[PDB]
Amino acid sequence: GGGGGGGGGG
Amino acid sequence: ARGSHKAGALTFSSSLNYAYQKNNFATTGQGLSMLNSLYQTPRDISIIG
Amino acid sequence: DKSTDDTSKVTYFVTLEREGDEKIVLEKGQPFVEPGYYAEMNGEDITESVQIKGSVDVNTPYNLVYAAYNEDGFAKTFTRTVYV
């Protein structure tokens, strides 16, 4: 498809 | 090794090569990698420590 | 030459446990006794260090705070309310 990122932590 | 020879009229040459390599990489990416882990460091924290 | 060597100190917290009840109720004139307490800092008993803020009048129908401080300030506390 189109590759997914990931948000981090805070 | 690369050699030629002439005897004629007729010439024959030959180039032969072997090439090795061994890489090790410091992986990148959004996961638990070395750089993505380095940049996520507060400005007051001592890395080398 | 590098610059940013860690500068931390390792501080050791106090461990303060409780004896008895949190709330306690008595009748006018029935004296207040100390239920007790236990305080520990780096395995060294420091219970004699424990400060108790406030008091409890037995003849006026009261909350007491017990604290223990280590060698850098960081405390461990708990309350004991008493009524009459």
Side-chain angles (χ1 to χ4, degrees), chain A, chain B, chain C residues 1-43 45-84:
Chain B
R2 291 173 263 119
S4 205
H5 188 98
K6 200 165 191 173
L10 183 134
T11 312
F12 69 92
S13 53
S14 180
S15 175
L16 301 188
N17 321 271
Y18 168 84
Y20 178 87
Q21 76 175 77
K22 196 202 85 171
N23 313 51
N24 306 73
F25 210 95
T27 319
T28 75
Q30 66 181 337
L32 300 167
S33 77
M34 182 267 323
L35 200 64
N36 170 58
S37 206
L38 190 79
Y39 283 167
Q40 294 198 39
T41 311
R43 302 294 311 123
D44 59 289
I45 296 307
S46 158
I47 289 186
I48 70 178
Chain C
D1 280 347
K2 284 182 191 172
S3 151
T4 64
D5 305 68
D6 175 65
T7 63
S8 304
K9 163 188 182 177
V10 172
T11 177
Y12 294 81
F13 293 123
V14 174
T15 319
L16 162 51
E17 276 137 12
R18 188 216 265 159
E19 330 299 11
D21 319 84
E22 182 182 14
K23 316 198 194 299
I24 290 178
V25 180
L26 309 158
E27 291 286 288
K28 186 172 130 166
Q30 280 193 333
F32 178 86
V33 185
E34 252 299 327
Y37 38 83
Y38 176 70
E40 175 169 317
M41 179 221 311
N42 217 348
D45 180 277
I46 64 161
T47 300
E48 55 277 24
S49 324
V50 174
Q51 292 147 236
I52 321 175
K53 235 65 175 290
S55 177
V56 52
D57 204 351
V58 192
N59 294 122
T60 304
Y62 295 98
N63 43 263
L64 294 99
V65 173
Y66 306 77
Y69 303 76
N70 70 341
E71 299 181 6
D72 287 272
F74 297 100
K76 296 261 305 195
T77 185
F78 69 97
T79 319
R80 185 176 270 140
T81 314
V82 187
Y83 320 86
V84 279

